[model samples]
Target: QNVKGGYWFKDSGLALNNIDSTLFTHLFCAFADLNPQLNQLIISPENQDSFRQFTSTVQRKNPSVKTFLSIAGGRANSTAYGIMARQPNSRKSFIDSSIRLARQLGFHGLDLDWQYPLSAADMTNLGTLLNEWRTAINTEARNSGRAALLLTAAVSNSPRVNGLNYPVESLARNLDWINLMAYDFYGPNWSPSQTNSHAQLFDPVNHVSGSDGINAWIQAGVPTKKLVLGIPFYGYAWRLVNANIHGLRAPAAGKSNVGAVDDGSMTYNRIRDYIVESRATTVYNATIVGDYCYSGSNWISYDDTQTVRNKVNYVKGRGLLGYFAWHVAGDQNWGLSRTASQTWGVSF
Candidate 1:
């Protein structure tokens, strides 16, 4: 309620990866911030019944935590099930089933994470799915005395996806906020001269600014206020092949330069460990543009704290909703969100 201090926590059934659920209690309770969507992998039809039991156990002890039913990332690359490219009856079944389950589990809304439309055939069906989902939720809210459920979708941060999604103008009007995934510009396959993430200007060497992601929304008529700047709670890693490296033109490699998969690639958690453990080679392209490279028979390239705070400043100057991270778990070691809280929550 107070300027919407919030985050989109990535919740999954991947308990095998970590032994601690205490992290959730520590972070969520500490902020009292909004956990916009509890990811669907933990609570979809396949695992819903079990997840209900889990949520009940957690909620009985901590009831202030509010969750939204997230529907994304499944058998398909794009989370277009039930809500996109489905037959009419199948679409209703998908939305209705989710609504019933969400209310039963005390979830307040829905986070629609349809990644892409794929083809022309997919477009009309996607539209119908959203229309029907919106209608059903609205109708249900009116009939009952509950508040209207929030509906949001995640889009790619690329110009290609912009063309595919029918421009951001109408799309912005329909959804509450665009979770502009402003990272993943530079990874293992990228050409040199990208900094991973930044805010001011787009530098080929330092992938700092939100040029591709933020600009897509702005150009397509999405208003600034409705945009949420996505910040990675982790940093990306690269490998330095050369014994000596200077600028973006230098060749590099690291544990692995990847998207969001590998442990030591271009993610915040990996980057933090790299920084504290390894000595890095850096260049000040500008106050807003800079590159840091570190090597151990190989190399890693990424943005530092200066560049990250610059991005946060950009968020403040633009008057957009505050930053969102890829996953809260990514920051547990570095205390990234707590750091954000200290800086962003200060009344200027």
Candidate 2:
């Protein structure tokens, strides 16, 4: 499969009812958790039955489309995963419950969404946990006469910035594939005085590009076949205090939205509507292969259809598995999702 993908159906703005399964080869439901006390995978009592509904709805539309239960989000934070993976007893409990729940919920696989591990020991332990998890899946399949569950992870894009948190080579050996979080290089909260593209296909000035990040992963011995590039379905918005400056690093006040889960960030749907409502002018940077909109002091850097298609071409030319969006809800009226299917000659 060429792997047109979508993610995080945990009622952000995206919901199962809004998804058209034929548009993607894989759909990852946002999160389920490992209960700290029980050391086992658990859904909020609220979402327990939602997982079942999520899978059935997808399969009803496209039986061949694979649905995965993504566990551990940024909300789960690293501590939960660290605690679950660091110890033998805890690790065993997590592995068993994950497989059981995934099967019970009618999912095709499990996506490990642990944000990261920042130390050598944690990295090594992560690799061990993956191997055990894979082995457990195999054992379960044989016993139950069921197909083996696919195992994958969301990983840091920049090995350089991640320090020793990821043992790239060893991790590649254990899991099915890895999703590179190749966006969020710049955001309002992270850089108060800078406004830049959240996901740059290539930026020669900053010497940061999604291509370079993927290359680093390949060099670290992770096979290109097992690497899936991630694209943001949203943009990072900031209120520019300095109406004039160069491209990036301009004076900026706090986020435009003020208080929210992610401060100044807005979904692509919101950004698109804002462009029309505010009459913002969109500007493109040829050097970076990205674009940003500006009206007054409000600036938002995000991917439009053209940029997403550019990325699709990159993935095809590079022999990658495919690309996945951060969240399906960000693209209203199926703009980006439809673009992906049309560009790849896939169906929706």
Candidate 3:
């Protein structure tokens, strides 16, 4: 089997030696922002140098692996995307600059992560932007006699998010692939009281899950082969107000500080460390294809090796393109990566 896998890079200082290129088909560097005044994309001064090395060093390990420069993570700088997409000059400028920046940085392509577009009008404009971007990419490739750059998006699996922002059919036609961000289905951010799975594969009770997301996208006309599911290497943690009533929707006092970056959420390393240190009780839900733990008042929902293996099997069974992890640094000792490599029979 030819296993296609990818990793998302957030920290430039991440040890290059830890990355096993043979295990991945692509590596997406976290972000390059859009400069509204300049009508262009700019890699941060901090990331400029490491970004180059990130691709080159990884390529040395596996020259065939492709690297992409991802743009606009979450909502921080995404508003500009809508502004640029609506106007022809701004749209063309953004597209041209993105391609130029990608080529200049030695990246194989760009992954548009624009968090989301807010309205139907925004969605329509986004379709236009994607089409124009594709045309520019093609023209650049033809003119330079270089292989066409891969185009993809880090997209939402939530029906609400998709319906609001994505023109599913249009996107499928214009882009090389869609990275389905199937995680963050639930979190303390949504409900401080709810102790729920943040990235469950199946959700029989709510019918809101990774599978549901994939089915919704496919039903909306995106080909399964063009979809790459996102697997989370993190978890959400909640502090229960009532320790006795520790169920999914139990009232929460607040969130637990599990990771350096966020409150009420944690990377896999922190979650695993807590489990081992505290001897937390673990439970796996076959119905949802997920797992969680509760000890004292702290409740955390996350995926383990077995759960990820289950997801890989689901991807294989559904004939999806493959899967990619949100952040490579989330797992320690290459814990989750090893599971992915083994399950997909990918080299590491």
Model 2: how far is 36 from its true place, Å?
0.9
Q: Write the per-residue lDDT of candidate 2 for residues 219-304, one digit (tens) a residue.
A: 88889988888989888878788756426556777576622456788888988889999898887776676778887778888888
Q: Which is better, 1 or 3, measured by lDDT? A: 3
Which parts of model 2 are misplaced by more than 4 Å? 258-262, 346-348
Candidate with the larger TM-score of 1 and 3: 3
Clashing pairs in 2: none
Ranking by lDDT: 2, 3, 1
Candidate 3 lDDT: 0.80
Per-candidate clash tally: 23, 0, 0
Count backbone overlaps in model 3: 0
For residues 82-147, write the lDDT of model 1, one tens digit per residue. 333457766666667667766876666566555557654565566676778778888989999898
Give all candidates' CA lDDT scores. 0.51, 0.81, 0.80
For residues 295-315, what per-residue lDDT tens digits would candidate 3 score against the true structure?
888889889888988998888
Worst 10 residues of 3 by lDDT: 1-10
- Please, what is the TM-score per model? 0.73, 0.95, 0.94
Model 1's alpha-carbon lDDT is: 0.51
User: Model 2 scores what on Cα lDDT?
Assistant: 0.81
- Candidate with top lDDT is 2
